[PDB]
Amino acid sequence: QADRRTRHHMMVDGQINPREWFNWHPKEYQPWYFDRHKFLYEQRQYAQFHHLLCHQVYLKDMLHLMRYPEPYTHIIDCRTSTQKMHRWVPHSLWLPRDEVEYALQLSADEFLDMYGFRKPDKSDDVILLSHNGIYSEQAGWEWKKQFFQHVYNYRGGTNELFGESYSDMNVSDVLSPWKGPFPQSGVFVDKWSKRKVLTRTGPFDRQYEMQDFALPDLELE
Amino acid sequence: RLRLSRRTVANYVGLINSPEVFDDESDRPETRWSQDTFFRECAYLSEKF
Amino acid sequence: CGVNAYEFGGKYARTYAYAFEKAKKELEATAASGF
């Protein structure tokens, strides 16, 4: 807390030296729409995985499968922390997220030995849950990595079913303000390009765009 | 389920479908109460609280 | 004696009864049942 100054060496250009060395150029980056309100994997940095997003099953589908279950629509819990689970979703099986990339590599007999329930067939419907729908989304990506044709995700599984207020506790790794990053300590590039990459135009909380080239606008004046 | 709720199961990994459980220290009839795992967890909190 | 091995016994008896009543209302919506 208390507004720690950060140990990065970014700086705005002064009022004395000319603007030079335009084979790198920082400018302010402003996109069209806000993405911070959206789901975490519906944001801007995950757009390329947009076709990898699992189809959504909703609350009413989950209540209908609670009341009237199907033999091959497998409800699977993807929550990892055993200290944060307090209730049982009906007709659910426990396959925690951090083991999924190993779990689908097993045979059916090894799946039965290492989890106590049968391995789902690749044509069976699989429905995944988590606290917010984040561990279930990564698990759905791991389930779609293998050739599983029908994989669905209930976004906000436990927190809407049981009414809890929990989270999957995703870190989203951001450097500590004592950790000095790469381009300050290094002779990987020449001194002009090193000074021109480390400069920015404005405060260092917003996003910027780095230009690899620039030509002078001779047609203005 | 009695062997699995103690400290000694930490030194064992098991098959979930058919877990062959270990020989606990309470499985031997010569074991006194001071060597019991679950009693020592209760004897610790009895002196504390 | 083997209802628990079939698709309509145990926890899935509620689905087979739900699909039986849902099949009846779709024949009741037309005049295939009420006539």
């Binding site: 055993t82 200290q83 689970m85 049982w88 009906p90 007709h91 659910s92 099986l93 426990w94 925690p96 989890y115 106590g116 | 389920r1 699995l4 709720s5 400290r7 199961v9 930490a10 098991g14 979930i16 877990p19 020592r40 967890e41 610790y44 | 145990g10 926890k11």
Partner: peptide, 28 residues
């Protein structure tokens, strides 16, 4: 009746797969 059996099959496998944190004792 199936929901009561399958819930006890659930929480007996959570105990088998992922063990929780062990409480404290005093070593001799």
């Amino acid at each position: 009746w199936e929901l009561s059996r399958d819930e006890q099959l659930f929480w007996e496998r959570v105990e088998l797969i992922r063990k929780g944190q062990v409480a404290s004792i005093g070593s001799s």
